Amino acid sequence: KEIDVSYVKIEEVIGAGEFGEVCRGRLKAPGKKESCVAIKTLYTERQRREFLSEASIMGQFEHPNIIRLEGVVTNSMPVMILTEFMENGALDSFLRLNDGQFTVIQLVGMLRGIASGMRYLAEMSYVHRDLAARNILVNSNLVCKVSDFGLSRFLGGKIPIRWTAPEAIAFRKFTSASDAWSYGIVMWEVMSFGERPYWDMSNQDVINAIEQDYRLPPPPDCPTSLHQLMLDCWQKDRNARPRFPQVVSALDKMIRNPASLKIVA
């Protein structure tokens, strides 16, 4: 979806990505109402192609828990990726600002949205590789959407150790099952209102700890069923981890039986 650059007004810089700035803007194209957009702006030709691979793959997705591509600008500089705008930004920082201010049911709803997005990606054979609360964006109604897409390999970025399943660290075998590990980490982040996973450990400490059977403890006030689901995501045997359809189904059952959520350590 090449977009005429005259249709785009950039309004403010709102963040930084791995290739450049993130801005808020407005897109108005003939036939369509004006919408608010987020804009990544961009190097070698390989880096340009890596940058744009995000748009290539995002444009192929359509799901309420996956950020929607509006278009790209490639015929002028800077080159741009334009998406729907998520007013509340990254989930880890949104939760820190809102520490202790959402109910367990609301937090489960967020996790259910993220798990539905992942179920869709897994169904499309897309392995995310960087599933982390920082890559979940949150709109005005607490709707959570998966972001940070691309087809580049890590050295691309560096493997995100704290979020990465042990077999993906050791052997670089990334699968939807290693994403399920990362999802368990995201659950822990959400229930801890955006605490850093393993905050008191270095990357190497995390690698060594997981190998020696350490798992993150239940966050304060975290329902035991939610922590058990984390522990299930963090099974060493990747084939024993629940798949995303089972994850969504587990969360939906908790939402049906909220009394279950009152059991805490």
Ligand X SMILES: CS(=O)(=O)c1cccc(Nc2nccc(Nc3cccc4[nH]ncc34)n2)c1
Residue 40's binding partner among Mg ion, ligand X, none (Cβ under 5 to 8 angstroms by kind) is ligand X
Nearer to Mg ion, 8 or 136 (CB): 136
**Catalytic residue chosen out of the listed positions 92, 130, 148, 179:** 130
Residue 205 known to be catalytic: no
What are the CA-CA distances from residue 188 to residues 73, 181, 220 (Å)? 37, 11, 10
Q: Is 148 in the site for Mg ion (CB under 5 A)?
A: yes
Can you tell me the distance from the alpha carbon of 136 to that of 264, in angstroms, rounded to the nearest whole number? 26
Shortest distance in whole angstroms from residue 103 CB to Mg ion? 30
Does 109 show up as a binding residue in the annotation? no
Nearer to Mg ion, 130 or 189 (CB): 130
Q: Are strands 80-84 and 35-41 parallel, antiparallel or unpaired?
A: antiparallel
Nearer to ligand X, 55 or 251 (CB): 55
Shortest distance in whole angstroms from residue 101 CB to ligand X? 16
Task: Please choose, out of 31-39, 92-100, 117-125, 146-154, the segment that lies near Mg ion by the rule CB under 5 A.
Answer: 146-154
Nearer to ligand X, 14 or 209 (CB): 14
Does 21 show up as a binding residue in the annotation? yes
Does 171 show up as a binding residue in the annotation? no
Does 40 show up as a binding residue in the annotation? yes
Q: What is the largest CA-CA distance in the chain?
A: 59
Neighbours of 60 (CB within 10 A): 11
The residues binding ligand X (CB under 6 A) are: 14-15, 22, 24, 38, 40, 54, 67, 81, 83, 85-89, 137, 147-148
Does 18 show up as a binding residue in the annotation? yes
Q: Is 130 in the site for Mg ion (CB under 5 A)?
A: yes
Shortest distance in whole angstroms from residue 185 CB to ligand X? 18
**Residue list, annotated binding site for ATP:** 14-22, 40
Catalytic residues: 130
**Site residues (CB under 5 A) for Mg ion?**
130, 148
